[PDB]
Paper text:
Protein samples were mixed with two types of peptide activator (tripeptide WVF, decapeptide SVRDELRWVF) prior to crystallization trials, yielding four complex structures, [name]-tripeptide, [name]-tripeptide, [name]-decapeptide, and [name]-decapeptide, with resolutions from 1.8 to 2.6 Å. [name]-tripeptide and [name]-tripeptide crystals belong to the P6322 space group. They have only one complex in an asymmetric unit, and their overall structures are similar (the root mean square deviation [RMSD] value was 1.07 Å). Because of the high flexibility, our [name]-tripeptide and [name]-tripeptide structures, as well as many [name] protease structures, lack the LA loops. Thus, by recognizing additional C-terminal residues of the targeting protein, the PDZ domain of [name] adopts a more open form and maintains a more stable state, generating stronger substrate cleavage activity. This is in accordance with our enzymatic assay in which the tripeptide-bound [name] is partially activated, while the decapeptide-bound structures reflect the further activation of [name].
[name], a membrane-bound periplasmic serine protease belonging to the [name] protein family, is a key regulator of the regulated intramembrane proteolysis (RIP) pathway and is responsible for transmitting the envelope stress signals in [name]. [name] protease is characterized by its trypsin-like catalytic domain and regulatory PDZ domain; the catalytic triad was surrounded by several loops (L1, L2, L3, LD, LA) but, usually, in an inactive mode, and could be activated by sensing a specific molecular stimulus. The catalytic triad (H123, D153, and S227) sites are located between two β-barrels and are surrounded by activation loops L1 to L3, LD, and LA (named according to DegS nomenclature).
Residue numbers in the entry:
A (entry chain A), B (entry chain A), C (entry chain A): 53 to 74, 103 to 377, 386 to 389
Write the structure that this text describes.
Amino acid sequence: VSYANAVSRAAPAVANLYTTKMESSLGSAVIMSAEGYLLTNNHVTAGADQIIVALRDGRETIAQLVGSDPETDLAVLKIDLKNLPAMTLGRSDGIRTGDVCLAIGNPFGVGQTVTMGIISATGRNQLGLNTYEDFIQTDAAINPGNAGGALVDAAGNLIGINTAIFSKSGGSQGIGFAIPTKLALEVMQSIIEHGQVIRGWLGVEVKALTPELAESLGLGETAGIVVAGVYRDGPAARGGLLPGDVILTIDKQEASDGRRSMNQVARTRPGQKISIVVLRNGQKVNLTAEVGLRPPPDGGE
Amino acid sequence: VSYANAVSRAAPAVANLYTTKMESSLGSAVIMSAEGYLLTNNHVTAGADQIIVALRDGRETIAQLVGSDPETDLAVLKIDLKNLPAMTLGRSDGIRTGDVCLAIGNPFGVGQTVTMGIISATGRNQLGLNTYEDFIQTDAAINPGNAGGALVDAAGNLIGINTAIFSKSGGSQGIGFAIPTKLALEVMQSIIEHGQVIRGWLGVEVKALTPELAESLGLGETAGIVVAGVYRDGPAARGGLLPGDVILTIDKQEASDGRRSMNQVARTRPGQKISIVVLRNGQKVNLTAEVGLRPPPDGGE
Amino acid sequence: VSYANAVSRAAPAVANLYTTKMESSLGSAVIMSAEGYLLTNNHVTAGADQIIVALRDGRETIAQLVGSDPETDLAVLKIDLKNLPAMTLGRSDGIRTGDVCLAIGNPFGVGQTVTMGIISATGRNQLGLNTYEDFIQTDAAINPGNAGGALVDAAGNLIGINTAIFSKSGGSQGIGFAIPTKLALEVMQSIIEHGQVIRGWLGVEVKALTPELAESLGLGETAGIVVAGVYRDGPAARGGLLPGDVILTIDKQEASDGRRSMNQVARTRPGQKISIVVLRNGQKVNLTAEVGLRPPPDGGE
């Protein structure tokens, strides 16, 4: 078959990044709107003193950093250039494992490069790369230099931002990871608006429901989550939260799973008052907390 | 195009294996029947003291070892679990080089992972990995952790058990090897029945027909095989067989090729009397032997 | 889908190469005509004392070296054998990035091997591998042992000669390079005719038009090329050419780009008189030169 039409569609909207820092390094980025906004990875541009964007048509320009988001490994850039080709968006929840995809980037600085593979899996958290993980996995060859570039579906629509690989060799072994478009678009929109992403911030821990601690517990291996360990000087601290008490309920929503609950708390607004309930065998043990702002906190695992 | 339907079909019947031994290691396995029998590689489970099977639906269970077959690198496991999804079988002789295939496994423990490539070649013996080799070769990315998992055709039917790779880097370089379904089903059936595979056993050697030894020989570079070297205390020993005499005929079938003849002898039954003929320029030199049982004897070449 | 028909078409015309030198090494080659001419890489056969060709059908024969071309990394071999299968030719300019292709070779000596990927990019010069570069890039897995073998389109027609890879691991990371058929056929035809390729030869340098040297220059960042540095005892030497003067015109054609101009000079005939113009702010500064012959001057970058 051929993916030429998909490449023709998407490749004009993928650029090369050349960054100098204290010294030179390489990457990719995706043009998201004709106004000149670009998505790339945080680790590509972090601390850079100059960022050059090189387009497929040959034009080069210096970019400005709009803002960056280390906890998803994303960053937004802005350029001032006319008649820019923008990427079409795919549906990252609309993808299935086994669908064909294309990676577009600048591996090893050889030039813009298209590789092909399939969606190997979706929803990869537990990789231990970023705080907020939801990776698409792909076997399209992805190498140092691909970071910040496009993962595209078989029609050329954007489904992710290529980010990381797992390798024992320094280069592709067919296990690569892209940030899904749905996550990346959120981050991008908020950075454009507020210079960063405003998360609901707690300063608290939580880990899995081990079986024997909840064995004695009346419920049976589901529908709850075990808590421990607490950060200090912040609102859970001031709200009476503390290592060892277990969390039934935060903002009235049961925090049954750790990753779910990170997200919910993340999608809250700082300064707001919300109630929190620590463990007792009954319904509640009632605390309150003022939602704070969370401070500030091609890769290979 | 998309392979999503093929993945939907086959992925439920591929499990993760977690084994502890004297210490923890990882692998994959394929559910072959709703009764709970699973195929995997011998090297994954060999000497394990505990074997956990983790299904795509989230269920986990301990497995029992039915039996194992080091000389093909296969092993059979059994689990006790209801409403199990079983793999459909493909036709491993029905495949052609250039057909698309999918590998399903747990590379590096990242999670169940689907990779895509083509049949690169079939019939790979001479790899020097197992005594009985007939590998399918594939460029679908295959890594440590894939061993024991499924190679599937473009419709999701099982064509092989992923086993080994050739790499200079510790991970996929696009040269991987799967045990064909036709071989694996034989092994599986006999292990389920007899706890191992019963081979016809000789205790004898044989190597290629070098050209100048058979130059003088009247026949012309075909249709025969040169012999040498003999194991002892066993039936060829007791049958009057010995290093240096060349084999015309075993069980009346001319042993013209070494790998062919291994197989024939393998598919004989121990305790049976069969006749053997050593080299002389005429028709025969007649010995007899009682067929013995052959004793006990993700990988990277 | 399946590429079996494409493999059936092309694989008979791809051979294994086994070369002994002062000691044994491996490679591939492509049968280009039924007369027994074969293309492979220069680095595979360079300095070999014996070259064996092994065909897919099992026939083996010794090959003769027709001639070789180090500056494109190509070499031509000849064998004497009947009923030979010849490769069909594709159109290497007719390919688009994103088209599917197949690599056919003998990676690591495992046997003839087919791998699949896409055209990742075309026109790769600046790799620094050969003097005359125009590589097709592909993510079809290509390993040591693939050099001299076929890159084929989805219908099995020849589009290139697999040559090199970029890797940090000694094997495929999905960045491989093939010499396009259009270049390779030229080289092959001239070697068959004249034992080598006759290039137009100058003995002179040239590098890019830096911006500030041509800033002051009236023209604006296009349509010219800056010169420097000169080889000696040869015709530019005898023609009055020299480091520092900048070249407007060679054989009346403006030498605006370095790689273009190499080619033009290459496609000229030795012994011919052609005029050359060095830099002055006006039209010309007029020299003459007698075109000389250029003397004599799976890889991993």
